[PDB]
């Protein structure tokens, strides 16, 4: 049985950490919602 | 039941002690999250009780109690941020700039974040606080990191 416990607002934060990179994949997506890379 | 606007953790009691499923999003009265975070089950606020009222696996997403309210759409060229809200942990906003998932039906904007699979569902927002998508639905890359779709509903 599940349930919900508010975690916050939903706003942009000025001076937030800056991470992560740009990746561009070619992929492909199922019937069950699976996302895969194609080759 | 607490309706207000923001995002939300999605515990269950099922397993040992209290443990994070997911994230969500209440907007306009409406709780949206991903498939694979709640299968479709009913949801509890307090003493009130949410009913999923659309779902679509292939999309992995989920509405509670009215349609999908979410539309703002990444702009292709913008940094955006992650909302992440980690089990047990305090919500974060990371920045990032999304990459791109070329497909047979078009691009999707990608973010190169690697959390818990209980942060699934939460919210990826513009420059405006607009959410754009949830975080949780990707793939695994060469070298075992993670890179998740900017998941988007469509509002009727
Ligand atoms: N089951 S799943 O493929 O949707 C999944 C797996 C890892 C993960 N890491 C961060 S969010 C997340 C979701």
Redesign the interface.
């Given at each position: 049985?599940?349930?919900?416990?508010?975690?916050?607002?939903?706003?942009?934060?000025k001076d937030?950490?800056?991470?992560?990179?740009?990746?561009?994949?070619?992929?492909?997506?199922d019937?069950?919602?699976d996302?895969?890379?194609v080759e | 039941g607490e309706t207000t606007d923001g995002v939300y953790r999605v515990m269950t009691r099922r397993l040992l002690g209290s443990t994070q499923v997911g994230v969500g999003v209440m907007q306009e009265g409406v709780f949206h999250t991903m498939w694979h975070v709640t299968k479709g089950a009913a949801l509890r606020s307090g003493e009130g009780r949410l009913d999923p009222y659309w779902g679509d696996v292939k999309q992995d997403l989920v509405s509670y109690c009215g349609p999908w309210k979410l539309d703002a759409a990444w702009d292709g060229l913008s940094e955006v941020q992650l909302l992440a809200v980690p089990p047990g942990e305090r919500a974060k906003n990371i920045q990032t700039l999304p990459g791109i998932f070329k497909t047979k039906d078009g691009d999707i904007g990608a973010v190169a974040l690697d959390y818990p699979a209980g942060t699934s569902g939460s919210p990826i927002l513009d420059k405006c606080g607009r959410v754009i998508g949830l975080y949780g639905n990707g793939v695994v890359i060469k070298n075992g990191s993670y890179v998740s779709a900017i998941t988007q509903g469509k509002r009727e």
């Open positions: 049985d599940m349930y919900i416990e508010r975690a916050g607002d939903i706003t942009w934060e937030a950490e800056v991470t992560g990179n740009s990746p561009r994949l070619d992929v492909a997506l019937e069950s919602g996302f895969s890379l | -």
